[PDB]
Amino acid sequence: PKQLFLESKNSKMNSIEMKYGQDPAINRAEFHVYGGVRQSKRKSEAWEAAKRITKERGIPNYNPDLHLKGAQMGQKVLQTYRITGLDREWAGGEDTPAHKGWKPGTDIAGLEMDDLNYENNPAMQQCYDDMRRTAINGLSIAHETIERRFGKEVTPETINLYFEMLNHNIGAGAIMMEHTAETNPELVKDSYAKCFTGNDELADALDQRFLIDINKMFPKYQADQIKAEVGDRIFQVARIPTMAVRTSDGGLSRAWVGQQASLAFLCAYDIPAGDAVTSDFVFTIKHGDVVFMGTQLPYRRAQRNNSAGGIALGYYSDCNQTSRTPEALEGLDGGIDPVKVIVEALTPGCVITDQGWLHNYLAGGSSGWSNYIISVYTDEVLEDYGYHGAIYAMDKWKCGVGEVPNTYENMMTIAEEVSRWSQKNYDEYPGLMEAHFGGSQRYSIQAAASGAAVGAMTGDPDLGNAAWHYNTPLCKEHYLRLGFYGHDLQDQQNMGHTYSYRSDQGIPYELKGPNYPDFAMNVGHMGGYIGIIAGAAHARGAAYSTNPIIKAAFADPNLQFDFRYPRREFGIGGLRQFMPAGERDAVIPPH
Amino acid sequence: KYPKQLFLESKNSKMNSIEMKYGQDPAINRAEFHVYGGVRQSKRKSEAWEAAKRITKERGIPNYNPDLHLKGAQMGQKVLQTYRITGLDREWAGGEDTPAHKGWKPGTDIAGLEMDDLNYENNPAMQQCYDDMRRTAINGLSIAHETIERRFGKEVTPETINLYFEMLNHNIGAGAIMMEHTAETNPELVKDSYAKCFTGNDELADALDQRFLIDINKMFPKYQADQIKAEVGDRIFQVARIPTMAVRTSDGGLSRAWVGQQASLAFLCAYDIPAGDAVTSDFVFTIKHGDVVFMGTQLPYRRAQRNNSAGGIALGYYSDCNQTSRTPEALEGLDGGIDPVKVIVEALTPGCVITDQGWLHNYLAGGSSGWSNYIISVYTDEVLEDYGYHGAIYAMDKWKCGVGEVPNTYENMMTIAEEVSRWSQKNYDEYPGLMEAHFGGSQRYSIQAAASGAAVGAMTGDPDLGNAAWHYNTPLCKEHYLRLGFYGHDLQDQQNMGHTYSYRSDQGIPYELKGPNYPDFAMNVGHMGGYIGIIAGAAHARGAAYSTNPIIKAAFADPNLQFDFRYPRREFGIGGLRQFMPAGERDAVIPPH
Amino acid sequence: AYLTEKIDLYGDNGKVLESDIPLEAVTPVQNPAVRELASIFKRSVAVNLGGAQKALSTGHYANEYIHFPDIPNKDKLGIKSSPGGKYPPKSVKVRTMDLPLVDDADDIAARLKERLQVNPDDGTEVRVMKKGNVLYVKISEQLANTGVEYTTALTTTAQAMTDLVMEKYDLDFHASPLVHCAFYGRYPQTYEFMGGNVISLLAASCANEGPGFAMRNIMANHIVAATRKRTLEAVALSSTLEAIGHVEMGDAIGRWRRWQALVHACQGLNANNVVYDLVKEAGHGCTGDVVAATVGRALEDGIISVKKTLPSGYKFYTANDPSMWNAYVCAGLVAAVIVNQGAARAAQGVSSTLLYFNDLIEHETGLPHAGYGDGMGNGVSFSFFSHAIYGGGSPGIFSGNHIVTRHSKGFAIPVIAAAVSLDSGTAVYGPEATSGLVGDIFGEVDLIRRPMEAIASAAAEIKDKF
Amino acid sequence: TTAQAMTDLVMEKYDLDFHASPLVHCAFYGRYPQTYEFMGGNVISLLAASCA
Amino acid sequence: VYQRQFLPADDRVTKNRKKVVDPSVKLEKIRTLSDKDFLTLIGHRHLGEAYRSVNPPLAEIGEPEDPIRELVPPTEGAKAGDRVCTIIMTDSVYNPPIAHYTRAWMYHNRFRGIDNGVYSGRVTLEMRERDLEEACRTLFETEICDASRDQVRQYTCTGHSCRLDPDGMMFDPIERCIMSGGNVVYQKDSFGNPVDTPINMGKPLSEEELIERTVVYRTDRGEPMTREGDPGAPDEEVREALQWSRRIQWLRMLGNMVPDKIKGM
Ligand SMILES: C[C@@H](OP(=O)(O)O)[C@H](NC(=O)CCCCCCS)C(=O)O
Ligand SMILES: O=S(=O)(O)CCS
Numbered sequence A: 001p002k003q004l005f006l007e008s009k010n011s012k013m014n015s016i017e018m019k020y021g022q023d024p025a026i027n028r029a030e031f032h033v034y035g036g037v038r039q040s041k042r043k044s045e046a047w048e049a050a051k052r053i054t055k056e057r058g059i060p061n062y063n064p065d066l067h068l069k070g071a072q073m074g075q076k077v078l079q080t081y082r083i084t085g086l087d088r089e090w091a092g093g094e095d096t097p098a099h100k101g102w103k104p105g106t107d108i109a110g111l112e113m114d115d116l117n118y119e120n121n122p123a124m125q126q127c128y129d130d131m132r133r134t135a136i137n138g139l140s141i142a143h144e145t146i147e148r149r150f151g152k153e154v155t156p157e158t159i160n161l162y163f164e165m166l167n168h169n170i171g172a173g174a175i176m177m178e179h180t181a182e183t184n185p186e187l188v189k190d191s192y193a194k195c196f197t198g199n200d201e202l203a204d205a206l207d208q209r210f211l212i213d214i215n216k217m218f219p220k221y222q223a224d225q226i227k228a229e230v231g232d233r234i235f236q237v238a239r240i241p242t243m244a245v246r247t248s249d250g251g252l253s254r255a256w257v258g259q260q261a262s263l264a265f266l267c268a269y270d271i272p273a274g275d276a277v278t279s280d281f282v283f284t285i286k287h288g289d290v291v292f293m294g295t296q297l298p299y300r301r302a303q304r305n306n307s308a309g310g311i312a313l314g315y316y317s318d319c320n321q322t323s324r325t326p327e328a329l330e331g332l333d334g335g336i337d338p339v340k341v342i343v344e345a346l347t348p349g350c351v352i353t354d355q356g357w358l359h360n361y362l363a364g365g366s367s368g369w370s371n372y373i374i375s376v377y378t379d380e381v382l383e384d385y386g387y388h389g390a391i392y393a394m395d396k397w398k399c400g401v402g403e404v405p406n407t408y409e410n411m412m413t414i415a416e417e418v419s420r421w422s423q424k425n426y427d428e429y430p431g432l433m434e435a436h437f438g439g440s441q442r443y444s445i446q447a448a449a450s451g452a453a454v455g456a457m458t459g460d461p462d463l464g465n466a467a468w469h470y471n472t473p474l475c476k477e478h479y480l481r482l483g484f485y486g487h488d489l490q491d492q493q494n495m496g497h498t499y500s501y502r503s504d505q506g507i508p509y510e511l512k513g514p515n516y517p518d519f520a521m522n523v524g525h526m527g528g529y530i531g532i533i534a535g536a537a538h539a540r541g542a543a544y545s546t547n548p549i550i551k552a553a554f555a556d557p558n559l560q561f562d563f564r565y566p567r568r569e570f571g572i573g574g575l576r577q578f579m580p581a582g583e584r585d586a587v588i589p590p591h
Numbered sequence B: 001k002y003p004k005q006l007f008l009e010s011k012n013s014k015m016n017s018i019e020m021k022y023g024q025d026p027a028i029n030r031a032e033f034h035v036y037g038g039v040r041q042s043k044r045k046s047e048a049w050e051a052a053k054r055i056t057k058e059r060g061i062p063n064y065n066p067d068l069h070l071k072g073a074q075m076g077q078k079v080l081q082t083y084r085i086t087g088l089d090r091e092w093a094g095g096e097d098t099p100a101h102k103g104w105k106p107g108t109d110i111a112g113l114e115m116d117d118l119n120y121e122n123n124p125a126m127q128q129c130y131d132d133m134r135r136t137a138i139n140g141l142s143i144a145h146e147t148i149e150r151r152f153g154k155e156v157t158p159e160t161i162n163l164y165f166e167m168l169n170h171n172i173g174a175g176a177i178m179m180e181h182t183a184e185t186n187p188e189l190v191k192d193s194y195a196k197c198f199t200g201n202d203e204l205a206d207a208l209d210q211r212f213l214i215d216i217n218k219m220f221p222k223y224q225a226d227q228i229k230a231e232v233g234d235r236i237f238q239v240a241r242i243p244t245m246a247v248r249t250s251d252g253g254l255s256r257a258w259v260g261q262q263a264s265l266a267f268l269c270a271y272d273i274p275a276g277d278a279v280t281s282d283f284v285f286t287i288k289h290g291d292v293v294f295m296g297t298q299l300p301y302r303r304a305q306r307n308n309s310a311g312g313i314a315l316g317y318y319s320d321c322n323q324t325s326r327t328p329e330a331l332e333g334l335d336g337g338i339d340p341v342k343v344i345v346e347a348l349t350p351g352c353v354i355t356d357q358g359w360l361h362n363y364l365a366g367g368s369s370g371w372s373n374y375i376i377s378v379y380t381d382e383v384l385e386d387y388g389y390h391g392a393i394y395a396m397d398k399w400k401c402g403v404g405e406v407p408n409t410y411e412n413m414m415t416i417a418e419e420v421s422r423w424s425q426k427n428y429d430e431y432p433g434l435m436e437a438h439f440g441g442s443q444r445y446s447i448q449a450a451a452s453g454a455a456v457g458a459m460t461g462d463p464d465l466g467n468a469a470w471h472y473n474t475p476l477c478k479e480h481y482l483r484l485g486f487y488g489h490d491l492q493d494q495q496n497m498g499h500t501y502s503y504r505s506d507q508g509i510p511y512e513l514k515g516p517n518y519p520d521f522a523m524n525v526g527h528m529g530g531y532i533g534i535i536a537g538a539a540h541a542r543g544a545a546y547s548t549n550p551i552i553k554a555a556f557a558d559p560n561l562q563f564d565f566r567y568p569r570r571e572f573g574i575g576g577l578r579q580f581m582p583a584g585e586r587d588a589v590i591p592p593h
Numbered sequence C: 001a002y003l004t005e006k007i008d009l010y011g012d013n014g015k016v017l018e019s020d021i022p023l024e025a026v027t028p029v030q031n032p033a034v035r036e037l038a039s040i041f042k043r044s045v046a047v048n049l050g051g052a053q054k055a056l057s058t059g060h061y062a063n064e065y066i067h068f069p070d071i072p073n074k075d076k077l078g079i080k081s082s083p084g085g086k087y088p089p090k091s092v093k094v095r096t097m098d099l100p101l102v103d104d105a106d107d108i109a110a111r112l113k114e115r116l117q118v119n120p121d122d123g124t125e126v127r128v129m130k131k132g133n134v135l136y137v138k139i140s141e142q143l144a145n146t147g148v149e150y151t152t153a154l155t156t157t158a159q160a161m162t163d164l165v166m167e168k169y170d171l172d173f174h175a176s177p178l179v180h181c182a183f184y185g186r187y188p189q190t191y192e193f194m195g196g197n198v199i200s201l202l203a204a205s206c207a208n209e210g211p212g213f214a215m216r217n218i219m220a221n222h223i224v225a226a227t228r229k230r231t232l233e234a235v236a237l238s239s240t241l242e243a244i245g246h247v248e249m250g251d252a253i254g255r256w257r258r259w260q261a262l263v264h265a266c267q268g269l270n271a272n273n274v275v276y277d278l279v280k281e282a283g284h285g286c287t288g289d290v291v292a293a294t295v296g297r298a299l300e301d302g303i304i305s306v307k308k309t310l311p312s313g314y315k316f317y318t319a320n321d322p323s324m325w326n327a328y329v330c331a332g333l334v335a336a337v338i339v340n341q342g343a344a345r346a347a348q349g350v351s352s353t354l355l356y357f358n359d360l361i362e363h364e365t366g367l368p369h370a371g372y373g374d375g376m377g378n379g380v381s382f383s384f385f386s387h388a389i390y391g392g393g394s395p396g397i398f399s400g401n402h403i404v405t406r407h408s409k410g411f412a413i414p415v416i417a418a419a420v421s422l423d424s425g426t427a428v429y430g431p432e433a434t435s436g437l438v439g440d441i442f443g444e445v446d447l448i449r450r451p452m453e454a455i456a457s458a459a460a461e462i463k464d465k466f
Numbered sequence D: 001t002t003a004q005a006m007t008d009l010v011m012e013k014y015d016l017d018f019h020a021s022p023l024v025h026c027a028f029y030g031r032y033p034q035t036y037e038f039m040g041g042n043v044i045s046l047l048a049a050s051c052a
Numbered sequence E: 001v002y003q004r005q006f007l008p009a010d011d012r013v014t015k016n017r018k019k020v021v022d023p024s025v026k027l028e029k030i031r032t033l034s035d036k037d038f039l040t041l042i043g044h045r046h047l048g049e050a051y052r053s054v055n056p057p058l059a060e061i062g063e064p065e066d067p068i069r070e071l072v073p074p075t076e077g078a079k080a081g082d083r084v085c086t087i088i089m090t091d092s093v094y095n096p097p098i099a100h101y102t103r104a105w106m107y108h109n110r111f112r113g114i115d116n117g118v119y120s121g122r123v124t125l126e127m128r129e130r131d132l133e134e135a136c137r138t139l140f141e142t143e144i145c146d147a148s149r150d151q152v153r154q155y156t157c158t159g160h161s162c163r164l165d166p167d168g169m170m171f172d173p174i175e176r177c178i179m180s181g182g183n184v185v186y187q188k189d190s191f192g193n194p195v196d197t198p199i200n201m202g203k204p205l206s207e208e209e210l211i212e213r214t215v216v217y218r219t220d221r222g223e224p225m226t227r228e229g230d231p232g233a234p235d236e237e238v239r240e241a242l243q244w245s246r247r248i249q250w251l252r253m254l255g256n257m258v259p260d261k262i263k264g265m
């Protein structure tokens, strides 16, 4: 039974061999014989488009012949990529707002690096936009103020009218005033509002078009856990237009919903224009009873709520919906598969924090640092290493996932074996060593596979992530090289900070994030931690890792991005088959 | 002694902007209500209703539904007025093709626009205007060149600068130069991204590849080019515009960081510097902090923002990024002489739309309306135009002088303000159709205050005194009508009657450097844009080429900008016609749709 | 309980300053000189009268090339300002004015001191420097401690200056915003008094990375400029500011208090002459020779001992005193930078020495390096962000509050101060470029320029209390 | 100082194992340092966070 | 003076690491380079050209009174005020006689006044120009430089992890380093610039020589750092590098929880 990177489980594709058309175990290659960028369909097409652009605007742009010392890019193979594990999927074939239904089990192979660049991939951009345009609030206080101050009864009928009105004004219309401007419905068709509740009788009394159905979206055991936390309360989940956050930031969401929800309360309950109660609605939405995807950031990297930088790792873990899919519930031979949850949750975890945030907010440029991150969700490499650690631990400790005692010693044992297996394959397959040519890719992958195995096997997220940092000596003392110049800042320091309680060192992994100082600057890490946190919770029988409200809030088929199968969605964007929201086609000239 | 009102007769096309809204004499105080079919009278809302039904069917959630309007009263119980862009019939230049549209034929009107066509949410011209401001990064290159010559040991010449710009234009949006196996961006998605430079040294300017130059001599009239070049001196300034699509995935604070990465790389590649040499850090530090000019400064925690958010843009920077100051209309539109009023009325258009719709609405509050009718009133139907020009003609006759020459005394400011307020009130009182068109008191109050400030600013050349005239309109307006504007409109008007010439900690500050973070202005619509116009006009009237920053003025004199900063009222109208093609769309990588 | 263990404080010449000092007597919570240093930073500001006068005169207010233009030759621009040129153009002057602030610096200083003074014998000081171009101001403890903030010297001086200039020259109403701009710059559109002419050694109070980081938001270039490049005095100032910062961060507490106090004593105050002795022994060598000297000194002092000998002959060492071992690694770290960057007289390699002195230490002993990961961690981040396109800058622009170098618990910034002090002028963003005024003005304060002797004398004054 | 003192004394008083370090820190500091505030923590001042 | 042990050396690989980093061990010269070819390969200055300076000579800059500074003699480059120049080398993952972290450890132990960065694909060394030239004699001419696996390249450095070419040479996108008549020659300088005549580096070492002298562990040749069955096994049953790695992790974790916890450990 070969490694998954040499033979995918069901399609039997050889992901590494397909890059070269040569046995990846052979240490031999011919260089300078590919015609440079001519071997790339996307860069060749880009060159021809660039010539037209230069002629039209009068300023040169993309020009591959500018490559240093006459050496065009492409002196070696510009490898293509295969999305990991698409041939092992069997569910999620429903049509989505972004594309017709994917046929589960169909692979996406031959993608070029530029197809998985955040700048060129609308699925990756929409993934982030869906997170930041979301506003979540408890409605108890607004209903309390209406009943106690205003004097009107709140019933399923008034809640339904409130949601019909909020869905009319959140993106397009006006209700109370004469002569008022409105937005073109075509530009905001992705904007809407819903609610969820732990009260099954209330859920059954509402118009289901406005309901996030916990009983439908989740398996029984997970629905029971979430409903027990939500209790007899109503939570609103509103998504403002993607186009609106694209003209500003995610901090607009709570303010925007503050305006529209206040108006829908005024109109659904006939409250006079200017009544003092109005201020309680906006205060409740913006501050009184609110859940944010991201918290504010300090002056150097100043941000209001809902920027990728303020999103706690556990919130990135819980907005992923792989935890409620059949693949994650019975993929490990009829049993729960926490590894499927880790490897999927780390895909937006890596792409959003590294490409969406570190790159598209803190640094930038035309590359999107794409090849660094592509390596974590393609060709079954990290997949093979992760499953290797799980199978090893299940056989050694004779138990299931989440049941290996969470001792420091067991963490070290598993980490040593996964590091060994990662190094064994990079050493025995020159073609794989060349595919993941950057040391950071190889270093992050052995550290992530080790953490995934420890997290999935012990159910302990801090211990799972401790295994990541222990890979620093294991990697360094073997190869005598690690990653890029500033890659091991956090790895070195977290070998000590993981179980430290000093002021800015101690903090559970669920609540760490891109503002934890050690993690604020470098790629190839945060996404891995995000996957580990999600998998550790999954392995110990939990429905989420950090916030049940976030988990329920993203169980929604009306989301533009499919949060259940992110690796697949990023591949669909790679095929140019993902239609994002926010485009301004309705009000611009033809093209 | 006053000419026929521009809102009743446009100067050249002779259109009656107020009458066209009703098909009835606007002086008659009579109207029939409840006879228009509600939203059925609106082309955009009627089309929106049909699109909504399709959207509801496709997604399974209802959306736009006009029948939800309170107590069975659909919107449209009165006329849902159309609008005419002010002064387009008085333009004679700016007919060049732009990246967003084929050349406008100067003097052509844009009339019959519906309110939804001038809603920031539906108008890509307005969105692109803001995006062009925030995606701009400006830097002096002296220190980067100094580090290469002293630290690295290589000579900087016009030839190395040209190669550096060719490389920066290759990597700012699309490609890689130094590394093997590197991802790149689709050129179609970033065709609006590029970098240029300008300098006060004419010999250096002539030695560079003109494709990378913002040519001060070609863009500005001689007297203005002389002033700008004297400030720039023998220095090179880089103006780089990162992709509109990139700021749309994050914020304007990305620009200095993005250019920090790409300019550093173009320096490494153009000068053959080893990968990892210590000098590399001086390039990114110079771009992000050492020698940089931002459109906007950072904001505090409650409204937290990195650089380049609309909230951090000083009023004077909004004034100077406007390019109406260098147009023939602003240079010879006043009977062969300079027309500071044309500058005020154009500079306040993006000033109002960006601060009120782009920022107060699209950042601090929100919703589906864009508060559009409030702000549409300041650049349509020649109403504010007539009031502003009234004050100028009145002052020129009274003081027997030209623009910028009325002594800047407090007594002179009060006299002009009283006359402009009087004229504004005379027209709103004598034309019921005009009173109904600007049905919100804030529109009428802001318009008399802005016209008064425009007249004082244009006639005295004093920006603080021009803006003092705005606040003096509060008693003049209130004691006449016994009503002002919306609930919280006069916070800043009341307090600035005292704060304008106060020097207390957070009260005193010149108007050029005030902005949306000056506490009095941080929350309310209908003001900041007016101040922005006044600042630009006061500088124009006293013979200046800019009001606050010569680098900002030169940085936006660029025909490759997606938005035409010379004629913003026209550009917003073109977006209203759905004829403005913005940058940042992702067509190249999305299904045929 | 008191940190009663005794240490000897040595000067930068390797001679004892004070003997038998309890560790407790050099801590920021007890030492009067260390406490006075923080008090000086809080209460001192500089008024740039020359800058204020020039901004008003030419209209180049604030920063970023801003210029409010006054045009004195309107009739020579070739434009008509009247319809049809009926009236000839006349120039106006509305954004600028000429005030003799520098010539009146002495009278202005007297008026500013009277406005800032709460009571006659309160300690308020105002000194005229640079022939009238700059005023050094130190407000009283009475005014400074009125409320809870550290910005009172900055806020009061800007307002007193603005008010007194308006009154002295009986300026008209038009002058109010312009004179306010001359001192405050872009405030309040900016939180900072951006481009203004009232300067504090502290950063704006909106800029901290966390609570208690104010004393850490001070660039290494400022420290080097204030100590005029005297290597160990720059190390002492940086280490002492980091020591105060760590107390304010809440990290000099409980089971971590001794560990934190020893970092300050051993690396910052040449306790027991360890720093000097290591540099003396290995000065003619490389970073590696400092590693050998550090391990040897730790063994000589009984701080570490052989734990186990592996079959190959390699010995694992054990820490008999873990907090003191960490402190000896911090001392060896600054010695290593002095030897390595001192040989090149070029600061850039400081980030490499920070990383590899610690990495060599672990490989040499089998004991953890400084900060159990932070020393190598910051060696990595600091190296990366001082030699790459991503951000950062030259060594001198970093501080305990910079995201790149904040992590280490007080032992990283002092090595940057040492390296930048030894630099021969190899950077463009060096102390003269970023901290000229800071060094010329605040460097005149003896306590800021030479803290070592002041801390030792103050520690000897209270040595019998513990 | 109170947040660190509480965290350290609780870790010492109950001789807690390494796993408790982040959790006990969270009990007093809340989301700090991912947040500047000791958000959702259990050490309260009458003053607001010093970033506000 | 305490005698350094440098690192655990229980086998051929770690003993090779110790030799490289121990400054008292002479690195054997295996090739001769003329002064003209040596300077041409570096590419910063040519033979007979005057050294450029970044600051005036040290004696003219007015160094302040500073007793500690007097204990550290400046290098000849520092005394002259030479520009700080960078040289970059890349070691293949395939059995090189020196690897990246060993370069940092060796540089910090053998050369004075350095700046150095370790990356997976390259290693920089930045010193005052004349000092850098002296250091490069060791980097280019001794046993730590196999011409086919340790190459000089200032940028476009990819190749460390790439498959070897048909001649066993490491890939170079700019083709600075080529195989001609069995010899490895530099047909362009470290910056990829033209050279008047190629710089001959001689023959590469044979495969068995490379395996004998390598500092890297490799699973394919049966010499991984962690062998099958080592995970979880007692310290005495694993490589000393793994016993050292486990110890550093235990002490960093316990020490950072409470420093006193590692006392006597
Ligand atoms: C370092 C710092 O930049 P400055 O040194 O402050 O210019 C910071 N940038 C970053 O952290 C860049 C992170 C992304 C680049 C590194 C990818 S490994 C920031 O923008 O606040
Ligand atoms: O070479 S560096 O490690 O500084 C950056 C890698 S993208």
Ligand SMILES: O=S(=O)(O)CCS
Binding pocket: A274, B485, B486, B487, B488
């Ligand atoms: O009625 S209010 O003045 O509060 C709001 C007007 S949009």
Ligand SMILES: [Cl-]
Binding pocket: C191, C192, C193, C194, C203, C204
């Ligand atoms: Cl300030």
Ligand SMILES: [Cl-]
Binding pocket: C192, C193, C194, C195
């Ligand atoms: Cl500032």
Ligand SMILES: [Cl-]
Binding pocket: D036, D037, D038, D039, D048, D049
């Ligand atoms: Cl707090």
Ligand SMILES: [K+]
Binding pocket: A069, A070, A071
């Ligand atoms: K070639």
Ligand SMILES: [K+]
Binding pocket: A208, A209, A210, A211, A212, A213
């Ligand atoms: K539903």
Ligand SMILES: [K+]
Binding pocket: B071, B072, B073
């Ligand atoms: K009706």
Ligand SMILES: [K+]
Binding pocket: C053, C054, C057
């Ligand atoms: K002057």
Ligand SMILES: [K+]
Binding pocket: C093, C094, C095, C096, C097, C174, C175, C178
């Ligand atoms: K004046």
Ligand SMILES: [K+]
Binding pocket: C114, C115, C116, C117, C118
């Ligand atoms: K007094």
Ligand SMILES: [K+]
Binding pocket: C199, C200, C201, C202, C203, C204
């Ligand atoms: K300061």
Ligand SMILES: [K+]
Binding pocket: C255, C258, C259, C323, E259, E260
């Ligand atoms: K201790």
Ligand SMILES: [K+]
Binding pocket: D044, D045, D046, D047, D048, D049
């Ligand atoms: K509080």
Ligand SMILES: [K+]
Binding pocket: E235, E236, E237, E238, E239, E240
């Ligand atoms: K063994």
Ligand SMILES: [Mg+2]
Binding pocket: A583, A585, B585, B586, B587
């Ligand atoms: Mg389209």
Ligand code: NA
Binding pocket: A406, A407, A408, A409
């Ligand atoms: Na344990």
